[PDB]
Structure 1
Amino acid sequence: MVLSEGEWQLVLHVWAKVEADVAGHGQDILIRLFKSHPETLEKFDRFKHLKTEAEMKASEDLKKHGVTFLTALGAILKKKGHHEAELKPLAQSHATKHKIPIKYLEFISEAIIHVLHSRHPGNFGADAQGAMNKALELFRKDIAAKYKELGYQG
């Protein structure tokens, strides 16, 4: 699929706001994901044990991963679609080492959209959400094709 420059603009305009606090958005998003879809916390051998949202908020490791994953996503979105190089090592490690099904990438895309909507209502109206959703669907479709080339999930 292909986004128009206008759509990339809306995505990078609200992302510039997220970047003012990467560790805070990374936490919110992961907690939203784990509270909504608790089965996803099982994939993390380092935090699996956390039982509550308070314990999640206080975990430094969880916050460190939030910064790690969000930074990578930000580096992919900034490419505006030209992200083949970036995707390769990510698809390999999520398909062979972590084993993250496409369905989970859809769950975290819903978490990203829930948090941006909460924190940035003004910069995340309907058109800006439609664009963000398109950019994440583009990210999932390319990762899913790479997963098939790599022998995973199919």
Structure 2
Amino acid sequence: VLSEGEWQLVLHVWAKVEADVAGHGQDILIRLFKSHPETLEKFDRFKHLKTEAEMKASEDLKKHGVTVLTALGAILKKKGHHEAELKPLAQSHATKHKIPIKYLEFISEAIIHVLHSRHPGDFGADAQGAMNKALELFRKDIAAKYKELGYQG
């Protein structure tokens, strides 16, 4: 359970992200695909992309980055009270997209890296730890839904 102060650190940096949702979403997906190429293979939509320059040039990738970060921002702003938001997301990611919880750990690393690069003054160690706790809570709750559905592993 995050404290109120932890949530305030999370949402303070997140309000900075929302000034350029699309640039953040590109940086995060590109970092994910470069650091963990197995993740790119889950996207029939993107797996034709073979270089970082091609990834940066893809408008459809930039669009999907906005989809992803908009969903995550709506979850963070619930400060843990996010059951309604996670149901469809866990369902689609477990049963349609076939995304292991481990790959959610990978994108969480990518999110934290990009926030640190773009917002260092609002992403000191206290805020890094709070955002790690928020993303852990996200993964914990998704993992429980995966387990219900027979996909935790």
Q: Identity over the aligned pairs, expressed in percent?
A: 99
Q: Residue 39 of structure 1: CA displacement?
A: 1.1
Q: Residue 153 of structure 1: CA displacement?
A: 2.9
> For 1:28 and 1:137, how far apart are their aligned partners in 2?
21
What SS does structure 2 have at the residue aligned with 1:20?
A: coil
Q: Residue 30 of structure 1: CA displacement?
A: 0.4
Give TM-score, length-normalised by structure 1: 0.98
What SS does structure 2 have at the residue aligned with 1:104?
A: helix
Ranges in structure 2 where 5+ consecutive residues have no aligned partner:
none
What SS does structure 2 have at the residue aligned with 1:51?
A: coil
> For 2:88 and 2:34, how far apart are their aligned partners in 1?
28
> For 1:7 and 1:64, how far apart are their aligned partners in 2?
30
| Deviation readout 1:46-74 (Å, 9 max, x if unpaired) | 11010100000011110111000000000
What SS does structure 1 have at the residue aligned with 2:46?
A: coil
Q: Residue 151 of structure 1: CA displacement?
A: 1.8
What SS does structure 2 have at the residue aligned with 1:99?
A: coil
Give TM-score, length-normalised by structure 2: 0.99
> For 2:82 and 2:145, how far apart are their aligned partners in 1?
12
Alpha-carbon RMSD across the aligned residues, in angstroms, is 0.6
In the comparison of the two structures, how many residue pairs are matched? 153
Q: Residue 117 of structure 1: CA displacement?
A: 0.5
Runs of 4+ in structure 1 deviating by more than 6 angstroms, as ranges, are: none
> For 1:46 and 1:80, how far apart are their aligned partners in 2?
31
> For 1:74 and 1:48, how far apart are their aligned partners in 2?
26
> For 2:11 and 2:70, how far apart are their aligned partners in 1?
14
What SS does structure 2 have at the residue aligned with 1:149?
A: helix
> For 1:46 and 1:116, how far apart are their aligned partners in 2?
25
> For 1:58 and 1:102, how far apart are their aligned partners in 2?
29
